[PDB]
């Protein structure tokens, strides 16, 4: 799911950027260090809203580093996974252990034990795919996956989903 949150970050500027347009550098550093990043507490930070109205506080010179630490308050769009949520995605990779479903900037891996008994791995087909009488699952296919578990690391998030429940799987 996509959320709008008010987040804060402690950005560090090298002394080489102490110039009249240092604020522009500060705004830049936010873009290439926040946008596209993954945080276990807020999820994938995708885009920053009101980029022209980012609140910048007074910077503090580090004792020995010589850089300045600025507390930046900004509004951004964050995609956070939660267990028990249902999302849609497209299969990108297939393997014996299971296939990975791409949902936004996150990849959900579905294990065989979480799949219906009917589906069976078929490595003879190129590309390898899971073949069932009702439907066939392969890369680029549309699958409705229910997130079964999520592990949030300081800089990475991985989740496991299932398609065994009713109204799941191929759409």
């Amino acid at each position: 799911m996509f959320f709008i949150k008010d987040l804060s970050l402690n950005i560090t500027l090298h002394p080489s950027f102490f110039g009249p347009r240092m604020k522009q550098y500060l705004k830049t550093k936010l873009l290439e260090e926040v946008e596209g990043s993954c945080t276990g507490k807020f999820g994938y930070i995708l885009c920053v809203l009101d980029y022209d109205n980012i609140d910048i506080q007074r910077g503090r010179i580090l004792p020995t580093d010589g850089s300045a630490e600025f507390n930046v308050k900004y509004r951004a769009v964050v995609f956070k996974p939660f267990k028990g949520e249902v999302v849609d995605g497209t299969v990108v990779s297939c393997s014996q252990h299971g296939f990975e479903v791409q949902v936004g900037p996150m990849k959900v891996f579905v294990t065989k034990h979480l799949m219906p008994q009917d589906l069976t791995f078929n490595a003879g087909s190129n590309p390898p795919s899971y073949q069932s009488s009702e439907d066939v699952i392969t890369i680029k296919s549309r699958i409705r996956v229910k997130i079964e578990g999520c592990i949030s690391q300081v800089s990475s998030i991985h989740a496991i989903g299932s398609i065994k429940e009713d109204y799941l799987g191929a759409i």
Binding site: L114, S162, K164, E165, D166
Partner: protein, 131 residues
């Protein structure tokens, strides 16, 4: 089968906090603890010797009457009454035809409950629901 789960044999004595539940699909009793561990992942065959009908966790409910057989009649009555519902004014106060209609509606329920003609009765019920 007195005060304990038939599957896990959790009696009220050793677990006063446990609670019982039933599923309308097969009317098979199962405690809350068994339901979570067996059906949390998804639909599966009923954990009974001789039951192979798939069921969903969300369909579980709690018994109202102490008799299993009576529960079957009411459950079928609820679905039947949602379509077979006509008042006295529906026939302009003519009780002669209303009584016959009431008997026919009750007759359908009786046949369904005892499975006299499941195939034919179900088709007629399905056909009438559209109209």
């Amino acid at each position: 089968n007195k005060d304990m789960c038939p599957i896990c044999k959790t009696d009220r004595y050793l677990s006063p906090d446990v609670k019982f539940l039933v599923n309308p699909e097969c009317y098979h009793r199962i405690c809350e603890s068994c339901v979570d561990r067996i059906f949390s992942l998804g639909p599966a065959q009923c954990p009974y010797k001789g039951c192979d009908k798939i069921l969903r966790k969300n369909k579980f409910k709690t018994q109202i009457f102490d008799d299993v057989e009576v529960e079957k009649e009411v459950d079928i009555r609820k679905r039947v009454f949602n379509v077979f519902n006509k008042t006295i004014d529906d026939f302009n106060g003519d009780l002669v035809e209303y009584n016959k209609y009431l008997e026919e509606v009750e007759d359908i329920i009786y046949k369904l409950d005892h499975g006299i003609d499941v195939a034919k009765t179900e088709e007629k019920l399905r056909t009438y629901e559209e109209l």
